[PDB]
Amino acid sequence: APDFHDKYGNAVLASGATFCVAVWVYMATQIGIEWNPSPVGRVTPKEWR
Amino acid sequence: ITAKPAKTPTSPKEQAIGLSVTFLSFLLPAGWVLYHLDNY
Amino acid sequence: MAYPMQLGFQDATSPIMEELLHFHDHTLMIVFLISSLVLYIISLMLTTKLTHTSTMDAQEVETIWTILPAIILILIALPSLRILYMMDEINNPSLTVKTMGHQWYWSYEYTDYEDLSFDSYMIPTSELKPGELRLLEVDNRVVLPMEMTIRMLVSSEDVLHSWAVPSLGLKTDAIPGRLNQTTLMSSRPGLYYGQCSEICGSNHSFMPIVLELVPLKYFEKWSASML
Amino acid sequence: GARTWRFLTFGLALPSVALCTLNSWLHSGHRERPAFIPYHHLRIRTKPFSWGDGNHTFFHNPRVNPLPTGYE
Amino acid sequence: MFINRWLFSTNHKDIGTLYLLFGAWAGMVGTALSLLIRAELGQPGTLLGDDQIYNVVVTAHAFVMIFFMVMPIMIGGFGNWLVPLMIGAPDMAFPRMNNMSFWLLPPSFLLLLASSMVEAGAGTGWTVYPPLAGNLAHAGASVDLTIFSLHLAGVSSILGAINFITTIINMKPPAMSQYQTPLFVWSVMITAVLLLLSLPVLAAGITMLLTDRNLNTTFFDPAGGGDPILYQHLFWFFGHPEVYILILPGFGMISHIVTYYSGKKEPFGYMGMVWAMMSIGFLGFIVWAHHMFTVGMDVDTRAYFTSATMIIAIPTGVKVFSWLATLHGGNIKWSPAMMWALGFIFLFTVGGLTGIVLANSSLDIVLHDTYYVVAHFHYVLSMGAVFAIMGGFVHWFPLFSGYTLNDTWAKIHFAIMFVGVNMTFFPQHFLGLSGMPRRYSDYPDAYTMWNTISSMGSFISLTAVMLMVFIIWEAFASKREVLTVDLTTTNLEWLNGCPPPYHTFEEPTYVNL
Amino acid sequence: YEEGPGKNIPFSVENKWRLLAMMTLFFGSGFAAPFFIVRHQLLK
Amino acid sequence: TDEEFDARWVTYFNKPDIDAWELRKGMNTLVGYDLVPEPKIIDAALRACRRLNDFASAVRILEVVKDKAGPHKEIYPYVIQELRPTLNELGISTPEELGLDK
Amino acid sequence: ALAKPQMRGLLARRLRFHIVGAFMVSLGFATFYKFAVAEKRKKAYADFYRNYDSMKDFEEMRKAGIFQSA
Amino acid sequence: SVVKSEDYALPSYVDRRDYPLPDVAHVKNLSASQKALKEKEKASWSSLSIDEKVELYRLKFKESFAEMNRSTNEWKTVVGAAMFFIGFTALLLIWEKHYVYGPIPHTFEEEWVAKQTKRMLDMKVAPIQGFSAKWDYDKNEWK
Amino acid sequence: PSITNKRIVGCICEEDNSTVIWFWLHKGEAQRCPSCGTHYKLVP
Amino acid sequence: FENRVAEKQKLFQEDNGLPVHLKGGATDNILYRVTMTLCLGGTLYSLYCLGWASFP
Ligand code: HEA
Ligand code: HEA
Ligand SMILES: CCCCC/C=C/C/C=C/C/C=C/C/C=C\CCCC(=O)O[C@H](COC(=O)CCCCCCCCCCCCCCCCC)COP(=O)(O)OCCN
Ligand SMILES: CCCCCC/C=C\CCCCCCCCCC(=O)O[C@H](COC(=O)CCCCCCCCCCCCCCC)COP(=O)(O)OC[C@@H](O)CO
Ligand SMILES: CCCCCCCCCCO[C@@H]1O[C@H](CO)[C@@H](O[C@H]2O[C@H](CO)[C@@H](O)[C@H](O)[C@H]2O)[C@H](O)[C@H]1O
Ligand SMILES: CCCCCCCCCCO[C@@H]1O[C@H](CO)[C@@H](O[C@H]2O[C@H](CO)[C@@H](O)[C@H](O)[C@H]2O)[C@H](O)[C@H]1O
Ligand SMILES: CCCCCCCCCCO[C@@H]1O[C@H](CO)[C@@H](O[C@H]2O[C@H](CO)[C@@H](O)[C@H](O)[C@H]2O)[C@H](O)[C@H]1O
Ligand SMILES: C[C@H](CCC(=O)O)[C@H]1CC[C@H]2[C@@H]3[C@H](O)C[C@@H]4C[C@H](O)CC[C@]4(C)[C@H]3C[C@H](O)[C@]12C
Ligand SMILES: C[C@H](CCC(=O)O)[C@H]1CC[C@H]2[C@@H]3[C@H](O)C[C@@H]4C[C@H](O)CC[C@]4(C)[C@H]3C[C@H](O)[C@]12C
Ligand code: CUA
Ligand SMILES: [Cu+2]
Ligand SMILES: [Mg+2]
Ligand code: NA
Ligand SMILES: [Zn+2]
């Protein structure tokens, strides 16, 4: 007799993965979090004095 | 280990209620305090 | 100072810090290798259906398990202790400077010749000049001659503090009633930053250290101008 | 029991000896001999020794034991 | 009946149950404290207030996790439940004194929570160093309430240690030598010896701090000829043994879990495992000043403490390799308890190795009072002591309760916790090497990325803690009653059924010579 | 004294919903306490 | 030596009046070793099952030979090959012949 | 007919083969790490200081306006 | 075969590949036809049918080796559910960012970071490997 | 000896084994240690 | 004095189901009630004192 994993495993794996990636990508990029990456190769230095 | 089947089975719906109530009991009071930090 | 996304030590400013980088590289290789070997052996023990569950004789294998680690510790201890004794070696300083920790700022005393002393406080975030570093700049930097052996003496007039400059390999506790000694020698001019490294109350996070390393002649004129 | 005392012999006592042996064999190098000073409280001679020339101590080491008149 | 049973207990199992409930509640407090820490550090700037409120939270976090969560669960909970059963004893030697060890902890905890409510709290660090902890820089009741909290927890564990040593020495079957007792029983006896010898020295030191604060003594006050560094020696004379106290019973539970889920009758190299635990216990008394490499001690003293500390890797290595040799050839059951134990072996090894880095005085100059130390101790505590507790809890819950956990949920719980603790602590190595100090409410801007990631990790660990409460609820809610347990021939604690009767071994075991 | 599953504990498991309430209050009060202590310290 | 180990195990299972307890003790002890038992040992264990009127234990013994081979798929078919004369003589069906490999 | 395969010590043989494999990889990693980390660092510091002019470094910093004292 | 709580002290049945011959038969009580089958087992096994042999196996044992050793889809549920709860955690972090965290300090503004970057290059922060080492002072650009 | 109809036996199969083998011995026919086969008989 | 241990042995072994802390008679109940009343009342007073000390 098929168990919970046989019936729902594929959907739990696919949905869980999709949901996890989507919400972490949104959190990481869309809500103003400051990661403060390296300026190297990214920032143009500007006169400060 | 072997065990008997559940004497009082917890259905998926019942588990969703228990998990929901558990999470809210942690999240609502802390959330109320942190939301109100400015006022404090 | 540290830079964003930094993984390792600040670049060495002093020969002893250079020595600590090479010693850390050697130790880290060993840590990587042992961690890796344990994870690999776990994965090896767990990936066969072959079994052997009868009693296993331990004594031969326990020789390997104790000797090889004993040898590895000796290979760490030897360079570890060479560096320990190298920092302790007699060097003849040209200059003595004192620092006193306070809640929540450093005072400096240069009293070889004249009575020069001043307080060194964090620049508030709202008073930073463009390009200056949050929580790291001070009003009055510790100006010192580059390429010279300096004796730093460290104490406190209240609670514990600790006077640290990572890029020079320095950390000396500031204890009331005690005068702790360390030596400082910068291979380079520049600005070298540190932060109070003993929990000392409300503004422990906000009493940093800034060394300004310049030629002797500049240090002399600065000293004279600070009396 | 004997089992316990054997456990202490091999698990604590001989490991201690092995570590002190390592400690000692790491500081076994010959130290720099100090300048000779003919101090009157040292190299005592009130009677010649009953062996050799009378002026050498029993386990005399030429490298580190000066005579009353200095290093050989 | 309820009062007689649960307030007046003289029963090792019920008292073990009280300890596990107490420890579980304490773990929720310590978790909340850990999230406030990581909320403060999760973005640059100030969230709560200055370093005082922050360090009250940090200080309370440590005391709760160590004194109210790990020690009560490992020693009071697993020790009381399992030790008598594993030696066929009818109870502890001092079943009424046992109950006072338990009932001292609620009051101890009440005094710690009082410290945090009065004045501005004890923002001292869990080390409580003077003069910050003295009556000038911490005027008022907070530090005294912390000292008294420690006194009651101290008495609890000293009387508990007398109870365990006596029970384990005196109450085995007469044919059973000490070399026929299970490794968990050894791990508790050795832990009890460490507690008996170390806690009285802590008691002396914090009593001196109490008299400096209230009776005009000057043990730690240079104005009277005292020395703040004397407090540090007395504290750490206790504090290094204390970390061995925190891990030893975890070592014992790991030996049982690895043996059990490898389908083995016995751990590899039993006498080596006994030797290793006794060696670690002894060496743990002669290394304390590795907590003091920056205070200004003499170079030869630093050389001695470096060397003596590194020696601990040898016996610890024998245990790690013996656990691997127990897995070797096993019929491996991938139970949730086995997952905790395998995570333990690996993550404990990593934290032990960062401890060997710190043992080097010269390198410790730059790592001391940095997040590198924080990374080391959370690998051994939050991924070592905690993984052994979680493994032991899921392994023995059916013995204690008579009910099974949902193994799928327990594996989910393991996976979430594994991700969260690594995301929390792995990046703290980088923060340490690059110079971020300990006990800071805020950091220079360069440290932002690793602090951000670490705080996100802490939230994943919170999700695992919430799920664990649900999983325990689901087990009691569903009532799946245990039927058969494998390997009872080498796991005596299971042989009286699940749960065992209130009175076991009324008729002792028969063991001949 | 009562022996057996659900009887060797100082709390009832006779009703899973009453148990959920009791567990919610027990673990919830422990987790809440530090947030309310911080609120208390901030409000002085 | 290998021949001495195998001879001890043949002798163990060949004891005419071996009892059920001894048959179990034997097989449960033998499967703890780092080996797949030689056909001559299995032959002697299967003839013990016959003396004990225990068909089911004979089938289980063939299963545990396969299991002890782990991923070495060549070992079980080799052992069955060597046992065919005994299986035919005693009327022992293999697990595969009984569908107990599904 | 099938050949008699090896039937004894298969777990011990797998262990021996892979511990030797682990030793060999361990030596491969140590050589790699010597070259990619340890020696790279010795050479970076040696190359930096070989022709380093501390007074010229100071003059650059001074002209950029970084110092209180110069 | 009903296993009872009150039976814990009696020899019990197990399916374990390392304990192939357990201490008791799976089925102890025999029907009339199961009794006749055990009598027939005392004669030549060649005279037993395939069905009778399977029936004798299933009286002695619960699961075959193939059944007790089978793989499951459980890993899908565990990994999927773990990813769901880790996803849920990001909701808590979104909530925290929106309702708890105020603005970050002005030193993270793009123009501040550009100026601070130049000042770090002017003071030659980490000039051997870490930072200024990655700046080309001759060409005025990152290497 | 027993005052009831079963008692736990621990069998130290060989001198100085660290592993004790535990089992219930029941009233009736002698039982054997499942490790060494040593016979034990209950005398209630 | 005279040896009256046998009379105390009879009293404390009497088959009356009392726990040892109450088996001496009515005086044990009184001293028990005094002890537990002072402990519980004292504990409630310590909580009141915390409430008071928790505010300025
Ligand atoms: C469970 C808790 C626990 C455990 C077990 C340990 C174990 C060890 N700890 Fe740690 N430690 C802490 C908890 C713990 N620690 C805490 C809480 C602090 C901070 C206190 C404070 O300031 O608040 C701390 C701080 C601390 C310091 C001070 C650092 C500083 O403040 O600057 C040092 C210094 O040596 C140290 C070292 C060690 C070492 C060498 C071990 C050893 O026991 C580790 C041994 C294990 C291994 C080495 C791994 C397994 C071995 C092998 C696989 C064999 C092969 C290995 C080799 C050849 C190396 N730790
Ligand atoms: C056992 C000890 C232990 C444990 C587990 C932890 C767990 C955690 N710790 Fe901490 N921590 C310390 C001991 C511990 N800590 C100590 C001693 C200090 C130094 C204090 C000082 O400087 O004075 C410290 C300091 C410290 C700092 C440094 C603060 C600073 O220097 O400013 C940080 C920063 O992130 C931190 C975070 C965390 C986090 C996020 C967790 C999370 O991993 C926690 C997650 C939750 C759990 C692990 C569950 C716990 C609950 C249970 C296990 C109950 C189980 C229930 C049953 C079995 C029924 N802790
Ligand atoms: C290796 C482990 C230890 C070995 C012990 C000794 C070995 C040889 C001698 C045996 C007897 C020892 C007993 C103690 C007596 C006196 C001196 C012994 C200590 C010794 O051996 O000292 C040596 C001198 O011996 C000297 O003079 C000369 C010594 C020889 C003559 C001794 C004559 C005196 C005898 C006195 C007897 C009295 C007995 C008492 C009886 C009591 C009854 C009531 C030291 O050598 P050194 O070159 O000065 O310094 C080293 C420089 N590199
Ligand atoms: C700042 C102020 C903080 C002070 C906090 C004070 C803390 C608690 C208050 C203490 C109240 C004590 C009440 C009396 C306790 C008596 C314990 C006792 O006497 O325990 C005995 C066992 O301990 C033994 O022998 C040997 C051990 C006897 C120990 C007696 C009590 C010691 C309590 C203080 C210990 C502190 C340690 C000092 C060293 C640092 C008896 O064991 P039971 O299980 O009862 O019986 C077993 C039956 O078979 C007996 O017939
Ligand atoms: C570290 C542990 C905590 C992690 C984060 C917890 C996640 C938060 C859970 C929800 O918490 C709630 O959030 C609401 C907002 O979403 C708050 O309502 C507040 O905001 C609402 C919307 O503005 C108003 O309607 C309410 O009156 C007001 O109390 C409410 O009090 C609070 O309990
Ligand atoms: C970042 C840390 C993440 C941790 C991730 C945890 C992964 C969860 C694994 C759950 O998946 C199941 O695991 C079982 C074991 O738990 C497997 O048993 C199967 O495979 C095993 C062979 O190794 C056998 O022992 C079993 O008999 C057999 O049924 C089963 O098929 C598999 O679906
Ligand atoms: C079994 C039940 C347990 C018994 C519980 C008893 C509780 C009642 C105690 C009475 O309370 C007292 O109140 C006094 C107020 O009059 C206080 O006096 C003290 O505080 C005064 C307040 O002004 C000062 O004058 C002095 O410090 C001093 O007299 C004193 O602290 C306190 O004890
Ligand atoms: C002698 C004692 C007990 C043996 C027994 O009676 O069973 C055993 C137990 C563990 C052993 C030790 C451990 O195996 C660790 C070490 C292993 C080395 O190969 C020898 C020294 C070493 C330190 C061993 C000496 C001795 O053989 C010990 C101490
Ligand atoms: C008379 C009485 C008999 C005791 C008895 O056998 O019951 C004696 C025996 C020993 C006596 C005690 C001891 O001789 C020691 C004490 C001597 C002092 O002179 C009187 C009090 C003193 C404390 C005595 C009191 C009393 O007289 C005792 C107790
Ligand atoms: Cu001054 Cu921290
Ligand atoms: Cu330590
Ligand atoms: Mg410090
Ligand atoms: Na902050
Ligand atoms: Zn036996």
XYZ file of N, CA, C and O in Angstrom, chain C residues 2-10 23 35 42 45-46 51-52 55-56 58 61-62 65-66 73 77 80 84-85 88 134-135 159-160 169 171 173 175-176 178 180 195-199 201-205, chain E residues 44 50-51 55 129-130 132 222 229 265-266 268 294-296 299-300 302-303 310 318 321 324 328-329 334 346 353 360-362 365-366 368-369 430 433-434 438-447 449-450:
400
model
N 39.742 46.151 8.967
C 39.023 45.171 8.171
C 38.297 45.832 6.998
O 37.951 47.018 7.080
N 38.090 45.051 5.934
C 37.400 45.475 4.702
C 36.206 44.540 4.510
O 36.132 43.460 5.100
N 35.190 44.943 3.730
C 34.003 44.116 3.579
C 34.305 42.744 2.972
O 35.180 42.590 2.103
N 33.574 41.769 3.497
C 33.602 40.346 3.099
C 34.952 39.725 3.451
O 35.266 38.686 2.882
N 35.710 40.309 4.365
C 37.037 39.759 4.727
C 36.880 38.368 5.352
O 36.022 38.196 6.247
N 37.734 37.428 4.951
C 37.705 36.035 5.443
C 38.800 35.858 6.496
O 38.557 35.109 7.461
N 39.994 36.444 6.284
C 41.142 36.150 7.162
C 41.643 37.345 7.965
O 40.903 38.311 8.238
N 42.896 37.263 8.352
C 43.558 38.322 9.129
C 43.742 39.583 8.269
O 43.979 39.527 7.077
N 43.649 40.728 8.921
C 44.121 42.014 8.362
C 45.574 41.819 7.910
O 46.328 41.051 8.536
N 52.247 31.141 10.515
C 51.927 30.106 11.526
C 50.437 29.696 11.432
O 50.092 28.493 11.525
N 39.678 17.866 9.725
C 38.204 18.027 9.548
C 37.769 17.215 8.336
O 36.768 16.493 8.409
N 33.659 9.334 8.139
C 32.202 9.159 8.395
C 31.503 8.666 7.117
O 30.748 7.698 7.144
N 32.352 5.024 6.356
C 31.742 4.058 7.310
C 30.265 3.846 6.946
O 29.739 2.766 7.333
N 29.609 4.848 6.326
C 28.135 4.881 6.172
C 27.707 4.489 4.760
O 26.518 4.555 4.503
N 28.993 -5.800 6.390
C 28.914 -5.713 7.852
C 29.990 -6.581 8.500
O 30.479 -7.582 7.873
N 30.325 -6.180 9.719
C 31.242 -6.877 10.648
C 30.883 -6.384 12.049
O 31.316 -5.287 12.361
N 33.103 -8.684 17.963
C 34.035 -7.856 18.790
C 35.281 -7.544 17.956
O 35.829 -8.491 17.305
N 35.719 -6.280 17.978
C 36.949 -5.817 17.259
C 38.100 -5.503 18.238
O 37.869 -4.758 19.256
N 41.304 -3.573 19.545
C 41.566 -2.118 19.560
C 43.073 -1.763 19.641
O 43.420 -0.586 19.251
N 45.445 -0.410 16.613
C 44.977 0.808 15.918
C 45.148 1.983 16.901
O 45.374 3.142 16.423
N 45.076 1.724 18.220
C 45.183 2.836 19.193
C 46.603 3.396 19.192
O 46.761 4.616 19.479
N 46.361 5.999 16.420
C 45.432 7.068 16.850
C 46.057 8.028 17.859
O 45.346 9.065 18.142
N 47.087 7.632 18.593
C 47.742 8.498 19.633
C 49.062 9.058 19.109
O 49.346 10.262 19.320
N 50.656 17.549 16.981
C 50.727 18.623 18.005
C 52.153 19.176 18.098
O 52.316 20.386 18.191
N 53.294 22.968 17.986
C 53.906 23.577 19.174
C 55.259 24.226 18.827
O 55.579 25.347 19.375
N 54.892 27.471 17.124
C 54.045 28.289 18.050
C 54.947 28.917 19.101
O 54.891 30.154 19.334
N 56.305 32.608 20.138
C 56.040 33.137 21.517
C 57.288 33.814 22.082
O 57.154 34.903 22.715
N 58.437 33.157 21.943
C 59.712 33.593 22.551
C 60.294 34.732 21.718
O 60.844 35.661 22.326
N 58.826 37.834 22.914
C 59.289 38.185 24.291
C 60.723 38.719 24.242
O 61.115 39.291 25.237
N 32.815 54.788 10.357
C 31.882 54.639 11.500
C 32.516 53.730 12.564
O 33.015 52.630 12.252
N 32.479 54.224 13.790
C 32.901 53.587 15.044
C 34.426 53.436 15.164
O 34.851 52.950 16.218
N 37.724 50.273 35.150
C 37.420 48.834 34.985
C 38.433 48.240 33.982
O 39.346 48.955 33.524
N 38.324 46.948 33.698
C 39.209 46.333 32.681
C 38.895 46.946 31.308
O 37.716 47.119 30.966
N 49.405 42.782 15.364
C 49.381 41.592 16.220
C 49.317 41.956 17.688
O 49.952 41.240 18.500
N 47.470 42.882 21.416
C 46.333 42.925 22.365
C 46.883 42.759 23.781
O 47.412 41.667 24.107
N 45.834 43.625 27.843
C 44.763 43.977 28.795
C 45.194 45.199 29.606
O 46.385 45.328 29.950
N 44.511 46.878 33.013
C 44.096 46.420 34.362
C 44.478 47.509 35.343
O 45.646 47.870 35.437
N 43.533 48.027 36.155
C 43.899 49.033 37.144
C 44.897 48.423 38.146
O 44.772 47.274 38.597
N 48.014 47.858 37.463
C 49.008 47.005 36.764
C 49.507 47.752 35.536
O 48.703 48.429 34.893
N 51.082 46.833 32.087
C 51.435 45.733 31.160
C 52.241 46.312 29.999
O 51.862 47.368 29.463
N 40.163 48.279 18.574
C 38.933 48.485 19.356
C 39.117 47.853 20.740
O 39.841 46.840 20.923
N 38.537 48.502 21.720
C 38.587 48.006 23.107
C 38.138 46.527 23.138
O 37.009 46.174 22.650
N 38.972 45.671 23.751
C 38.834 44.199 23.698
C 38.677 43.599 25.102
O 39.059 42.438 25.282
N 38.033 44.341 26.028
C 37.492 43.807 27.305
C 36.223 44.620 27.689
O 36.205 45.911 27.610
N 35.159 43.804 27.862
C 33.808 44.317 28.213
C 34.006 45.311 29.379
O 34.551 44.924 30.437
N 31.470 48.096 29.968
C 30.219 48.806 30.278
C 29.562 49.416 29.059
O 29.779 48.925 27.930
N 28.759 50.451 29.279
C 27.777 50.998 28.288
C 28.388 51.295 26.911
O 27.624 51.230 25.935
N 29.649 51.757 26.841
C 30.218 52.192 25.535
C 31.500 51.429 25.186
O 32.350 51.983 24.474
N 31.553 50.167 25.575
C 32.605 49.166 25.209
C 32.803 49.119 23.681
O 33.967 49.041 23.251
N 31.716 49.186 22.901
C 31.735 49.117 21.414
C 32.338 50.404 20.800
O 32.622 50.377 19.620
N 23.747 46.867 10.956
C 24.607 47.851 11.599
C 23.720 48.920 12.243
O 22.680 49.242 11.707
N 22.354 50.680 24.472
C 23.831 50.711 24.472
C 24.325 49.346 24.945
O 23.533 48.388 24.988
N 25.606 49.230 25.242
C 26.191 47.908 25.564
C 25.611 47.367 26.870
O 25.792 46.176 27.099
N 24.622 43.638 26.953
C 25.465 42.659 27.679
C 24.674 42.023 28.814
O 25.040 40.942 29.190
N 33.753 39.453 35.656
C 35.052 40.055 36.078
C 34.833 41.373 36.829
O 34.138 42.279 36.344
N 35.533 41.567 37.961
C 35.723 42.900 38.524
C 36.805 43.619 37.725
O 37.612 42.974 37.033
N 34.422 45.798 36.659
C 33.091 46.082 36.035
C 31.954 45.493 36.903
O 30.927 46.203 37.068
N 42.850 46.839 43.793
C 44.225 47.272 44.024
C 44.379 48.304 45.151
O 45.397 48.292 45.794
N 43.145 40.225 38.664
C 43.566 38.981 37.942
C 43.411 37.752 38.857
O 43.144 36.635 38.348
N 26.922 -4.558 19.709
C 26.693 -4.926 21.120
C 27.545 -4.030 22.041
O 27.288 -4.003 23.217
N 28.566 -3.381 21.524
C 29.543 -2.642 22.322
C 30.255 -1.579 21.485
O 30.446 -1.711 20.262
N 33.526 0.418 20.203
C 34.948 0.105 19.934
C 35.827 0.653 21.087
O 35.720 1.839 21.466
N 46.194 37.212 27.445
C 46.438 38.657 27.183
C 46.549 39.455 28.492
O 46.646 40.683 28.384
N 46.525 38.815 29.663
C 46.444 39.585 30.942
C 47.839 40.078 31.358
O 47.922 40.884 32.295
N 48.909 39.608 30.705
C 50.282 39.951 31.102
C 50.989 38.881 31.921
O 51.730 39.226 32.846
N 56.259 34.674 29.949
C 56.361 33.850 28.717
C 56.390 32.337 29.036
O 55.775 31.547 28.290
N 57.104 31.893 30.057
C 57.233 30.432 30.334
C 55.868 29.883 30.786
O 55.478 28.796 30.408
N 52.975 31.110 29.736
C 52.235 31.028 28.446
C 52.662 29.768 27.678
O 51.784 29.126 27.063
N 53.953 29.423 27.726
C 54.470 28.246 26.991
C 53.866 26.970 27.595
O 53.391 26.099 26.860
N 47.195 21.774 24.458
C 47.179 20.972 23.209
C 47.092 19.453 23.472
O 46.467 18.747 22.637
N 41.260 9.856 20.400
C 40.952 8.421 20.604
C 39.438 8.251 20.641
O 38.948 7.298 20.068
N 37.977 8.759 16.941
C 38.352 7.594 16.091
C 37.633 6.328 16.560
O 37.246 5.542 15.717
N 34.145 6.419 15.143
C 34.220 6.012 13.719
C 34.388 4.497 13.613
O 33.686 3.876 12.773
N 32.066 1.469 11.842
C 32.755 0.573 10.878
C 32.117 -0.817 10.918
O 32.167 -1.489 11.968
N 31.545 -1.272 9.813
C 30.961 -2.618 9.795
C 29.572 -2.688 10.399
O 28.991 -3.773 10.403
N 19.556 4.694 10.044
C 19.539 6.158 9.834
C 18.371 6.784 10.585
O 17.513 7.460 9.977
N 31.297 15.220 13.681
C 31.945 16.124 12.700
C 32.095 17.542 13.306
O 33.166 18.109 13.299
N 39.105 21.536 16.963
C 40.295 21.972 16.207
C 40.456 23.496 16.314
O 41.617 23.926 16.449
N 47.236 28.173 21.093
C 48.543 28.774 20.771
C 48.542 30.210 21.278
O 47.957 31.033 20.625
N 49.214 30.484 22.395
C 49.228 31.821 23.040
C 49.537 32.909 22.000
O 48.762 33.864 21.879
N 50.602 32.770 21.216
C 50.994 33.809 20.236
C 49.805 34.125 19.324
O 49.487 35.311 19.141
N 46.804 35.977 21.037
C 46.904 37.452 21.238
C 45.895 38.112 20.292
O 45.066 38.932 20.740
N 45.878 37.681 19.033
C 45.036 38.320 17.999
C 43.621 37.727 18.007
O 42.741 38.465 17.631
N 41.927 36.406 20.828
C 41.302 36.554 22.160
C 40.261 37.682 22.122
O 40.550 38.731 21.557
N 39.116 37.500 22.793
C 38.080 38.560 22.899
C 37.638 38.960 21.485
O 37.263 40.139 21.283
N 35.265 34.228 10.307
C 35.746 35.332 9.447
C 35.727 36.625 10.272
O 36.690 37.395 10.302
N 38.817 36.334 12.742
C 40.129 36.555 12.107
C 40.274 38.034 11.748
O 41.384 38.557 11.872
N 39.207 38.665 11.277
C 39.275 40.039 10.767
C 39.127 41.044 11.925
O 39.155 42.239 11.636
N 34.305 40.648 20.904
C 33.195 40.080 21.685
C 32.492 41.204 22.471
O 33.145 42.211 22.837
N 31.222 40.960 22.769
C 30.394 41.759 23.729
C 30.156 43.168 23.173
O 29.835 44.078 23.955
N 30.124 43.277 21.844
C 29.763 44.506 21.099
C 28.294 44.485 20.635
O 27.849 43.546 19.984
N 27.570 45.569 20.912
C 26.199 45.836 20.409
C 26.224 46.319 18.946
O 25.168 46.285 18.279
N 27.371 46.752 18.446
C 27.480 47.269 17.063
C 28.933 47.183 16.596
O 29.837 47.038 17.424
N 29.122 47.199 15.287
C 30.406 46.859 14.640
C 30.683 47.844 13.519
O 29.788 48.347 12.856
N 31.966 48.106 13.251
C 32.353 48.805 12.039
C 31.705 48.140 10.817
O 31.493 46.925 10.790
N 31.388 48.995 9.860
C 30.585 48.693 8.651
C 31.171 47.504 7.895
O 30.362 46.733 7.368
N 32.497 47.329 7.861
C 33.122 46.206 7.098
C 32.566 44.826 7.550
O 32.545 43.896 6.779
N 32.126 44.675 8.789
C 31.697 43.370 9.358
C 30.222 43.070 9.047
O 29.710 42.087 9.514
N 28.305 42.043 6.273
C 27.799 40.859 5.538
C 27.786 39.648 6.484
O 26.733 38.962 6.554
N 28.880 39.348 7.197
C 28.906 38.089 8.000
C 27.941 38.218 9.188
O 27.284 37.232 9.518
